[PDB]
Structure formats: structure tokens, C-alpha cells
């Protein structure tokens, strides 16, 4: 037991009891505990004296609970000589002491730190020295503004296990990841801002250290910090985000400190690294591993669809794999049904969360599932740790289990509340203090030591993606090609090919339209994917699981149980029928031209809106409603959706432009894209052109509006280009069709990129293989050699036309 003075507080007190006897000057008064009311009591008379004001009772009342910790010794000050009448002022000099019981249930611990922190403020002792896009960029401007992060050592793995060449920055991130996991064996060679340093008074060592966030005190300077294996690797996409992480697993693939521990002589998978990855990147991580791993001894395997029967025994067995990749939807699925096969009865050696910002909503089952995973070392690969809210970082901290910020009460007290009340400058300093030793963020805009940017960003990158038509599209393209080949034989047999020059371009145009979509020549459903998910949810809620088997009544034949389940025909209004019974009704109602109504509720059920169950039934999700009649999508629209369904998880907030010369094609695109994509994650904008000037600028207004919770699409005509339209905010473009002149397509692409931007424009050109579109590219390559400009209007003009007509069929 020791004691030491720390400070004094002067305060007037209102008298409570009318003491008549004179009160000594240096009276050793005391504080008794019981809007708040604290009591004054003379130590020798054992009688109450007065009450303290509200602004002082709030400081003293919670400090009395920690008498062993903080002792308050009040002394009397002024001796007017008169008895304390009802209301006379009592002048006190409160002396404060910090006992060794303070020096070295979250609400119990926070109430103590808050009470002591309030005392230090009154003592006045100081140490020795939803989000908007504008508020979010101010956050990055600090958390990415580390003090010269360009001097991190470059660690190189031996090229017997890693067959890729790491960049300058990729070699640095590998060394930092090895340092975060305390893997010194693969490194050459080679405080706590939250803990501040106070000073001792000298009126009644010369320093002492304290952390007023947790209320902890220490004699010496405690440098103990960061008892965490791993961290968060934030980076702009393309800084070797995934490639660097694979370099870590190939460098250290198992717990080396544990193999010797068990060989010296269980639910520890001391050799397996779990990589939770979105399904859109499920096979890419498998591919990126094989493309990078050279050591055949360590193998990776995808865990999807319950392919591995017993995962618990397999991952701690004699030949467990070094990497296991699985979907968040697998973690979320097995977490709900209490699946005890694996993933929750083993402590994996390492866990890596690619695009880990998908657990930002801590209240969803997917987030609760990821935090429930046990591992020795944890990692978070995320290009955007914050999406739309500040507490999105909390789940990233709660996953890493960073004490005491993993506790929600510490976060809401020191981060959420000070931010939500305008004092954002402090909450940013608390966040930046706990994530500084854990997170490492770099930028393609950052410059190196030599004087070059980390990544040379070209203005654009155009890529031609060749597609092959469907089985039905080739027959239409062939039928239109046969008639196109005949109109050439007609004019050529008449002595002059150009006698059908207008008639041939019509057949060529119809060939161009077939490649885009077949509906551009002259039973389509009217239910989007968002509605099918809503109808499936309503359907599973109606026919809920119980003791007995599922039964489905037919509203026509009154059959209590329809068999088989594939013969179940479900209307737009979620009413069950026998598939033959419903078809007989529609055929009878169509042969007499009577409008179709539901035989159960008499509602306008459209024939294309008839639904059926998915065959087979996923036991983890239940019944799924798909269109009874099969829907068709053009090969290019099928390819575009395949790109967009990946950029959705590849990069949030990305604005994309879709080009097409056919105005009707853009109309079909909007209908198909909005139908097959979720509305809360993909926003589609179209440029009709005929709309008023204010609405067209209002569309571009909402399009430029950056939003990391969705991706935005702009469907404008290639014909008009983007003349007078600001398109700088776009990072990706899609050329759904080529044109005769290359200048019109190049000009539209060049209206996107502006020098001084942090992202290159990625362009993809969908060209149907061995089609007229592939021929039109060779025409553009001719116009890039000499131009649309031509000499001669007599013979040279006619001769030039003969070449292009032939090139389309060569
Ligand atoms: Zn029936
Ligand atoms: Zn009905």
C-alpha cells in the first residue's frame, strides 16, 4: 500500500445542517455518499454539514465507489467566525490521492475509467507531449496518411515455392504480413499512442503513465501492445491485394512452433488456412493459387456444396490441406443450422477474409458466422474497409478480437457517440490509433522513393472478348447469311455489283442485329429476379415445415396432394395447380379468346408468369420459384451480366457505361439488366435523348453520385457519343457492338478518361466470333491505316466500295 497526491479542487458548498459551534480552519472534513446529491460531514462530530452543487456532485459521486483506488480528502478553507446558517457558503479545498489500488462487465470497467477521467479534467492535469462521400474521403485522407510508409523492407521468397514476380510494393506487403504474424524466420533483421504520459505534482520517479480510456495505470512505461496475429491489409485494388496474400501462405503454411511442440511428446488445424471468399471469386482463388504455388506438397481445395464429407477429421488429419477456400454463404448456411461437420469445431491455423467488408453489418447472420470462426491468426483483405457507415470498422475489429474495442460498449462510448454528436475529430483519432499498428494502406497515387507513382496508370485498356452464339442464334444468323450471300450473286451476275449496294447493306445490317439480340428484327415474362426472390420467400413462409410432409392442393381438381413435385404449377399469385390442370384451362381459355384469370382468386395471371419449383430442391434454402417457361437472353447480354455480377464484388461504387449504336438494343438492355440484377446493388440509368435537358443533366447528376453500396450503369447511344456529357466518373466501358468508323468508338471512349485520375478505364468489346462484327473490326483497322477520308469520286470511290463488301464474307 502506497498513496500519493495528484491535485486539488476548490468548491463552495451549500450548508445543510445549522451547526452552531465554531468550525476549525484546517478542519479535516469528509464526503458521505447519500440530479445527484453528495453529503458533507465533519469527521469529529459525525454530523452532516452541507450539500455540494450539481456540477461537483457529478464529479464526486462515482468516485466514492472506488475508495481503495481514489481517496478524496476535503479540507475547510474560510473561517468567517459565524455559525453556518441555513444556506451559508462552505468553502472547501478537495485534495485528491491516487492509491496503489488504482495503479495496476464492460459497464463496470467503463464507469471507473469515465469517473477517473472526469476527475483529471476538474483537477486539470495534462500529459507531457451514415457517411457522405466528402466525409468518407476525409476519413481516408487520415487513415491512409501514414508517416512515410515507403520504407518497409522488401522480403523475397525463395523461387522454389513461389513462381510469380512480386512488384516493389508487393514485396513490402509480404514483409509486413510476416511481421504481423511474428514470423521472424523469413525476415532479415529488425509508445502505444493510446497510452499517454502524465506527470506527478510536487506540492504536498517524476512521471507516471496512464490510459484514461480503460482507466489503467502503470509505474513503468508498458510497451506491451498488439497481442494479435495478423491484421487488415487495405489497399487500392490492383496493389497485389490477392497476390500478396498467397505469397504469405506459401511462405508460412503451418504453425511451425506447434509441430515441434507435438513432436516433443485436439481441435487445432495447425496446417490449414481458411480463405472465406465470395462465390464470384471462388474459382479465381483456386486458379490464382495454382498459377502461383510451386510446392506440390501443400494443396488447396474448394469446400462448396458439402463435397468434403467430414471436414473436422480431414482438416486435423495426417494429410490435411494447407488452404481451404469457401463461400461466405457456406459459413452463413452452416452457422444457422448448427452444422457440426466442420468449420465450427476446429481452430484453423489461419483465416483470410478477401473483400472482408461484407461482414460490416454486424447484425446479419453472415457477419455473426464469420466472427464465430476460431483461428490462431486472422486477416482481412479489403479495398474499402468503410462502405457507408463508420461502425463498419467495428465488425472488422470484432473479428480480429481486439481488446477492448471488440466490446461494443467501448466502441459506442469512445467512437460512435463522439462521432454522432459532431465531435468527429476525436472519433477519427481513436479509430486511427487502434488501427495504426494493425492496418497498412497504400495507394496507386502514392509516389515511390525514386520519384515515380506506385502504379503507372495508362489512360485506357481496351480488350476484345470474342463470344460464340447460342444453338438457336446460329440458325438465325445462318438463314440471314444465306440470303445475304444471294443478293451479292444477283448484282455480280448483272455485270455490276453495286446495282444491289443498298439491298446488300440491308442484309448486312440484319446480320449485325442478330449478333446483338434477335428481337431487333421485327411470350416474354414480366417478373424480375427481385420479385422471384420475394415470391419464393412468401412461398416458403406459407408452406412451412412441420411434422408431416409438404402437400400442395390443386384449385381445379381439389387434389389434396399433387405428385410429383415437378408437376406443381404455381401461378403468379402463389396458388398451386397440377401442371396439366392449369394447361388445360389456359388452352381452353385461349381457344375462345377469353382473358386468363386464376381459377382460385380470379386474378390476371399471365401465361408467361406461371412458376414452378426448382429441380432439385436445395435443402439449405428450401423451395425456389423459377419461371415455368424458359427465358432467353442474347449471347452479349449473357456476357455482360457475367461481367457485372463480378464487378459487383470486385469493386464497389464503380460507375460503368454501356455503349450501343442501336437505340432499341439499349432499351432491351435496360429491361434485361434490371430484371436479372438486384435493385439495391445495381442502379441502371438510360439516356433516352428525347428527354428534357434538365432531366438528362439530372440523370448524370445521380450517376456521378458516388455510392459504395451499389454500382451504377449508364446506357447511352454510341451514335450521339458523349458529346456535351461529363463521363469522367466512369471506370469501365462495354462496347456491345462495333461500327464502321473507328473514330466514333474511340471518341466515346476518350470522353471518359482524363489525365490526373486514380483509375484506368477498362474497356471490353463484345465481338461475336467469325461474324460480321469481326469483319467490321478489320474495316476499322483499314480506316486507322488511311482514314475515312478517300480520294477520287469517279472510279476510286466505286472501287473502294467493292473491297468492303467482299471483306465481310471472306
Ligand atoms: Zn389438378
Ligand atoms: Zn390465384
Author numbering: 174 to 207, 224 to 293, 311 to 335, 360 to 420, 431 to 444, 454 to 514, 539 to 795, 827 to 1114
The authors write:
We screened through a number of fungal species and were able to purify a nearly full-length fragment of Rad5 from the yeast K. lactis (KlRad5, containing residues 163–1114) and crystallize it in the absence of DNA. Structures of the mercury-derivatized and native crystals were refined to resolutions of 3.3 Å and 3.6 Å, respectively. Minimal differences were observed between these structures. One native crystal was used for diffraction data collection, data from three mercury-derivatized crystals were merged and presented. The structure revealed an elongated shape of KlRad5 spanning 140 Å in the longest dimension. The HIRAN, Snf2, and RING domains are well resolved in the structure. The HIRAN domain and the two lobes in the Snf2 domain are nearly aligned in a line, the RING domain is located on the side. In contrast, the RING domain has little contact with either the Snf2 or the HIRAN domain. In our structure, motifs I/II have located over 20 Å away from motif VI, suggesting that KlRad5 rests in an ATPase-inactive state in the absence of DNA.
